[PDB]
Amino acid sequence: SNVPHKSSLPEGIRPGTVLRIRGLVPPNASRFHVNLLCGEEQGSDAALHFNPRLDTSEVVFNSKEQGSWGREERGPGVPFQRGQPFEVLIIASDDGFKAVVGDAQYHHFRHRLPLARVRLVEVGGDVQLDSVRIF
Amino acid sequence: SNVPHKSSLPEGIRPGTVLRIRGLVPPNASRFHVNLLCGEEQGSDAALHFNPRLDTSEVVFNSKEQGSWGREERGPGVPFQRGQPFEVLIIASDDGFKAVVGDAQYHHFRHRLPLARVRLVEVGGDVQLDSVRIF
């Protein structure tokens, strides 16, 4: 494992930016995450932390600012399964991020940090990442 | 076998809206269309008319305002084939519609009508639809 994926967003992201993540959850995965970060330094603020937790069957959403985590939000269940492929859309809108899993909107995360600060996508944890694409 | 597919959008669509269309272009297909319409009336204004033409090997984009069509825009060649499945994203931003076809950004259509007018997605013509989803 032990390596996160990083993708720069040269144009930043605006309402209408779509991140498509395709991958599969390894059969003994505990957790993985997708972070929208505001810069390339290791403590940088996270506009969005999307963290499916399959050892506890839940999906946590949060933000991180000046080094401290915000309040956890969480969706209905976990739309991921060990050993199973997935396709996630993270869609930037004017008032938040829409997290789509499969064929259904899973959660709407209202913006906590300004959208214009987001500068990179990071994908880490127990996941087999097939493809990260920005549209 | 096939039918005009309508998705009603009573709250409209906002920037950061993804229309995902999956289907088959059947073996003898001439052309098909995805319309973002402003109402349910016959001949409603169209914010976007997306029109792959298999018979002429072009993809046409246009609008229909106040009864008459605008000037057509064309994408580069035809990324559709008779007898092949496809995935199209139509992504609404503040300034236009982004068309993605099978992992490749394909064309950008600047708004000609205010996005707020859109009330209905219609998919018709020579296509065998798998799914239409609006996120």
From Swiss-Prot, chains A, B:
Residues 5-135 form the Galectin domain. Could be involved in cell-cell and/or cell-matrix interactions necessary for normal growth control. Pro-apoptotic protein that functions intracellularly upstream of JNK activation and cytochrome c release. It is found in: Cytoplasm; Nucleus; Secreted. Mainly expressed in stratified squamous epithelium. This is Galectin-7. Keywords: Apoptosis, Cytoplasm, Lectin, Nucleus, Secreted. Signal peptide: none annotated. Induction: By p53/TP53. Monomer. One of its GO terms (molecular function) is carbohydrate binding. A beta-D-galactoside binds at W69, G70, R71, E72, E73, R74, G75.
